[PDB]
Design an enzyme around this catalytic site. Structure first.
Site, PDB file in Angstrom:
ATOM      1  N   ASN A 182      46.709   8.859  52.007  1.00 44.18           N
ATOM      2  CA  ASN A 182      46.685   9.155  53.432  1.00 44.18           C
ATOM      3  C   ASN A 182      45.814  10.374  53.723  1.00 44.18           C
ATOM      4  O   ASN A 182      45.588  11.226  52.859  1.00 44.18           O
ATOM      5  CB  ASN A 182      48.106   9.390  53.948  1.00 44.18           C
ATOM      6  CG  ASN A 182      48.177   9.454  55.462  1.00 44.18           C
ATOM      7  OD1 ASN A 182      47.216   9.122  56.155  1.00 44.18           O
ATOM      8  ND2 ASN A 182      49.321   9.885  55.982  1.00 44.18           N
ATOM      9  N   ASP A 241      48.550   8.877  45.977  1.00 39.62           N
ATOM     10  CA  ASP A 241      49.390   8.727  47.178  1.00 39.62           C
ATOM     11  C   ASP A 241      49.534   7.226  47.454  1.00 39.62           C
ATOM     12  O   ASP A 241      49.754   6.445  46.515  1.00 39.62           O
ATOM     13  CB  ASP A 241      48.807   9.544  48.318  1.00 39.62           C
ATOM     14  CG  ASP A 241      49.767   9.693  49.483  1.00 39.62           C
ATOM     15  OD1 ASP A 241      50.708  10.510  49.383  1.00 39.62           O
ATOM     16  OD2 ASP A 241      49.581   8.992  50.500  1.00 39.62           O
ATOM     17  N   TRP A 242      49.407   6.789  48.710  1.00 41.17           N
ATOM     18  CA  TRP A 242      49.586   5.377  49.026  1.00 41.17           C
ATOM     19  C   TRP A 242      48.523   4.513  48.364  1.00 41.17           C
ATOM     20  O   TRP A 242      48.758   3.324  48.111  1.00 41.17           O
ATOM     21  CB  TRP A 242      49.574   5.176  50.540  1.00 41.17           C
ATOM     22  CG  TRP A 242      50.893   5.461  51.177  1.00 41.17           C
ATOM     23  CD1 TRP A 242      51.226   6.553  51.923  1.00 41.17           C
ATOM     24  CD2 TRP A 242      52.064   4.644  51.115  1.00 41.17           C
ATOM     25  NE1 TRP A 242      52.533   6.464  52.334  1.00 41.17           N
ATOM     26  CE2 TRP A 242      53.070   5.300  51.849  1.00 41.17           C
ATOM     27  CE3 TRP A 242      52.360   3.419  50.510  1.00 41.17           C
ATOM     28  CZ2 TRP A 242      54.351   4.773  51.996  1.00 41.17           C
ATOM     29  CZ3 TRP A 242      53.631   2.897  50.656  1.00 41.17           C
ATOM     30  CH2 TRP A 242      54.611   3.573  51.392  1.00 41.17           C
ATOM     31  N   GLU A 276      50.611  11.843  42.154  1.00 44.36           N
ATOM     32  CA  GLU A 276      51.296  12.050  43.436  1.00 44.36           C
ATOM     33  C   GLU A 276      51.590  10.715  44.114  1.00 44.36           C
ATOM     34  O   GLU A 276      51.445  10.558  45.328  1.00 44.36           O
ATOM     35  CB  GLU A 276      50.478  12.959  44.354  1.00 44.36           C
ATOM     36  CG  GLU A 276      50.419  14.415  43.911  1.00 44.36           C
ATOM     37  CD  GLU A 276      51.605  15.228  44.404  1.00 44.36           C
ATOM     38  OE1 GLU A 276      52.123  14.926  45.500  1.00 44.36           O
ATOM     39  OE2 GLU A 276      52.015  16.172  43.697  1.00 44.36           O
ATOM     40  N   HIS A 302      49.308  18.794  46.622  1.00 41.50           N
ATOM     41  CA  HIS A 302      49.265  17.345  46.793  1.00 41.50           C
ATOM     42  C   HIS A 302      47.879  16.792  46.481  1.00 41.50           C
ATOM     43  O   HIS A 302      47.718  15.959  45.584  1.00 41.50           O
ATOM     44  CB  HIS A 302      49.683  16.955  48.212  1.00 41.50           C
ATOM     45  CG  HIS A 302      49.664  15.478  48.453  1.00 41.50           C
ATOM     46  ND1 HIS A 302      50.287  14.580  47.611  1.00 41.50           N
ATOM     47  CD2 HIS A 302      49.090  14.739  49.432  1.00 41.50           C
ATOM     48  CE1 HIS A 302      50.102  13.354  48.065  1.00 41.50           C
ATOM     49  NE2 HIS A 302      49.379  13.422  49.169  1.00 41.50           N
TER      50      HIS A 302
END
Lengths: 229, 306, 230, 309
Positions: free
Chosen positions: D52, D119-120, D143, D284
């Protein structure tokens, strides 16, 4: 409107403390009055069991109700909002000696009376420390930082015992206050200024009598217009 | 400074204690002293310290009487005893009057001593100068050794410095420092009113009558600034007690006490010491009298059986 | 207070040199600024000169970047201004509410009319998910430091509240021992120093910080009941 | 948050236009996908999947290290970066997956693909791993969306933020205030980004409103077993189960120290067999804090994977 909370401006109160300092168990009781809008109170503490105390009495002075706090209009009173049901608190004390104390108390409302039931437990008290030596004259004024954590309020404090040598002996006190019911608004970061003193102690009495004034306020130093935070 | 009482009607008032005490001419004055008389084949002599008198042992001695004769004097210039002829109250003056008082009791060949504070110092010096005449020594909050450092001691360095200065004479001779403040401060419980009246009675007037309470702390045996003669005395008797392998001893530590934490290490380099401890500060007699008396009683019994 | 003469004027400049180590990250910082030693205000520009970027929240070194910049009234002894021209030193212990610890040893001297401060900052046992390692801190809220005398030293004790992006707060307990380099004539009674340390010149320009401290010393504002203890 | 510059980052800074001039674009379904391709060594293909708030720019300094070892492809997800918008304006996980698979089919990929997810972007990869288990050679993640969330005990204090995002308030948090672009992204990077570097991230979401939807729709897909989207939760459970039985498939987990989600997900990553573990210093968006160490770790992992034939 105080009457809606089940409170009047001037409230009586009765307190029962069960304490264990080291291996000495004891039980005290307190009778007093106070003003919950202005923030004054005076309690008469007497030892019902465990007399005499093999330690300094003043360690249980903070154990003997934040309802007695003068909160101005621009700061929300989390403790007055907490009634009729009342509120609890869990309190951790670390003396600079290295010893510790735990104070868990429930403040309820019964027939226009603050019924406070408190449990005190201290340990690791240093032998040559002012608590065991009983060098403590009393407590100095203090500033307790109060802020919001989700549904609870947290206050952190540095309490200073004055000693008969004129020196001072501090302890760090952190209290988590939790309302029994939810409240409409949680307060922003602020302070509660305390002064707890012993009033009539000069009488050859077998009881202590203490008076606390507590007034809430923000910092009196102006934040530079657009500074952080 | 707060404190709260305990239980009252087993009290021994001042006059109640004094109406049980005797008096005797000693040198150019007189000594007031309690005597249990019975079982005179042994003598346990109780020696109080500063700010106190024989009254201090009132609830302690009833335990030891059924096994020995217990004699408890008011030191010179204190309690109900007379004043010193020259008006001075240093350690050697108390020692002079006390050793002269010893001759008039028809004591036994060997004596047991129970000393507290400076009375322990008197007993220690008498033991150093009469090493064979000692059967046993019980001491508490004692002047065990010289003071090289203030590390484990209570915060009294500035107090002692002020007392040794000219400030001490308005500290005590006028505002009664050791009687009105120190004595109640170093007792865990709140003294009943007449109990404190008994202690205040000898020094209820301002002036030189309170001098014995000013001169005792000016004797404190510090290697730096302390009276060299008293430091010599303390060195001598401390070495002797360190070498006294055959002398039975009993140390009643006070928990948390006042001097006990700073003095146990030294009191402890003396052999043949049985260690017990009771709750209290300095004047441990007003906090744990019965337990202390039972300890002393069993100690004296065990000494008398061997 | 009679500035005559601790070798100081009313408005003093200052240079600060910090050597820091957080966990095992070694870094160096330099502060340049000025303040008023009688009203208790100061402004410092802080730059990282070695070890950038920082793997921790910068705000933990803010209280390490001088109690000479304190507004003391006439009724309370000014220990720190009394400490000069030699200056003073302090040793500072910080215990974060989650577990971490920090030692701060600093020396404040006076040379050529400026405050030369040399600071050593070391931290350890910082929690991984703590707001210092996560850089969740917006800044420091105002604080109240209890000050009292201990023979020849002065002890200050406070709690410091980092406000976070959450709006929640994270506290740490700070105990400092201030030792003057030479004896001072008057040691103060128990009082408080109210601090407000803020970050000004926010911009978003720069890779440095500008922080302003206001420190006002005062006794309690609540009246002591007459005849009360202590 | 007071953050400082990397004093040695300006001399190699790759601006937004500089990165976008190195990228191609291909029609995918009813839109197109902008992407980066190193082309050479097409025998293997390693695909980097951003999460994201970011785009392929996220890997600009990571991917060179791996290029002499394999062909690396880094796309911009649909509606993000310089990619095209989604046909119906929806930006759920399966909406990204649709265009991602259709773009996969137009790249002449090897039979077994290497994936590097963040992430995603890891979820996507994980999903593509569960639906095409014979098409996966090695999986790199960091992450990452690993397993569902049943408790917040190890997670950063993001529960109330998530409750606000999944609410109506999120609309003005993201669409009109650009929460993830202007608050989360710079605050979850240790170093202070150069102005051009942050401009590269802000450009796709420079204007207020609906074009910021992919940054509001991504968090509303969070797989909380209480309150989450049920189909996303089932997808995550499916590929978590499949990943737990992957003794065959090599993996590398790059733990961010202290990181953001890594503390709460490294235990779940341990429950994946054949998973090497390395660590870099960051929050992150660890790529912006330790890109070269990450790149060398991944390069050697790919090499060791391509030697055990």
């Amino acid at each position: 409107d105080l009457a809606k909370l089940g409170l009047k401006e001037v409230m009586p109160t009765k307190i029962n403390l069960e304490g264990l300092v080291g291996d000495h168990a004891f039980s005290m009781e307190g009778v007093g009055e106070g003003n919950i809008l202005e923030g004054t109170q005076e309690v008469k503490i007497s030892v019902t069991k465990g007399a005499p105390l093999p330690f300094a009495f003043d360690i249980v002075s903070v154990a003997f109700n934040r309802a007695y706090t003068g909160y101005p209009e621009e700061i929300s009173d989390y403790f007055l909002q907490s009634f009729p049901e009342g509120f609890t608190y869990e309190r951790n004390i670390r003396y600079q000696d290295g010893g510790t104390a735990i104070v868990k108390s429930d403040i309820s409302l019964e027939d226009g009376k603050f019924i406070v039931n408190v449990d005190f437990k201290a340990k690791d008290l240093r032998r040559m420390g002012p608590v065991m030596q009983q060098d403590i004259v009393g407590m100095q004024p203090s500033y307790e930082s109060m802020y919001t954590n989700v549904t609870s309020v947290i206050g952190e404090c540095i309490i200073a015992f004055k000693l008969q040598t004129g020196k001072h002996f501090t302890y760090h006190m952190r209290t988590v206050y939790k309302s029994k019911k939810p409240v409409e608004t949680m307060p922003l970061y602020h302070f509660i200024q305390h002064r707890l003193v012993k009033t009539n102690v000069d009488t050859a009495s077998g009881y202590v009598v203490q008076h606390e004034t507590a007034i809430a306020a923000h910092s009196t130093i102006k934040k530079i217009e657009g500074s952080l935070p | 400074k707060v404190y709260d009482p305990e239980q009252r009607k087993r009290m021994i008032t001042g006059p109640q204690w004094w109406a049980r005490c005797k008096q005797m001419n000693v040198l150019d004055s007189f000594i007031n002293y309690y005597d249990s008389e019975k079982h005179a084949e042994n003598a346990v002599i109780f020696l109080h310290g500063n700010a106190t008198s024989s009254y201090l042992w009132r609830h302690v001695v009833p335990h030891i009487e059924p096994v020995a004769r217990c004699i408890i004097p008011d030191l010179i210039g204190m309690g109900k005893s007379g004043k010193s002829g020259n008006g001075s109250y240093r350690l050697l003056d108390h020692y002079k009057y006390l050793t002269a008082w010893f001759e008039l009791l028809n004591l036994p060949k060997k004596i047991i001593f129970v000393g507290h504070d400076w009375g322990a110092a008197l007993a220690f010096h008498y033991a150093y100068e009469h090493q064979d005449r000692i059967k046993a020594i019980v001491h508490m909050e004692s002047v065990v050794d010289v003071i090289e450092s203030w590390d484990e001691w209570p915060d009294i360095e500035e107090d002692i410095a002020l007392i040794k200065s000219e400030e001490g004479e308005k500290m005590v001779l006028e505002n009664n420092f050791f009687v009105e403040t120190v004595l109640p401060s170093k007792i865990m419980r709140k003294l009943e009113p007449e109990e404190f009246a008994a202690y205040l009675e000898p020094f209820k007037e301002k002036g030189e009558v309170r001098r014995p309470t000013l001169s005792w702390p000016r004797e404190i045996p510090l290697v730096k600034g302390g009276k060299p003669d008293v430091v010599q005395i303390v060195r001598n008797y401390n070495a002797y007690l360190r070498a006294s392998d055959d002398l039975p001893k009993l140390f009643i530590e006070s928990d948390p006490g006042f001097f006990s934490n700073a003095i146990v290490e030294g009191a402890k380099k003396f052999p043949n010491t049985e260690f017990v401890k009771v709750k209290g500060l300095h004047f441990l007699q007003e906090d744990a009298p019965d337990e202390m008396g039972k300890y002393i009683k069993s100690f004296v019994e065990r000494v008398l059986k061997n």
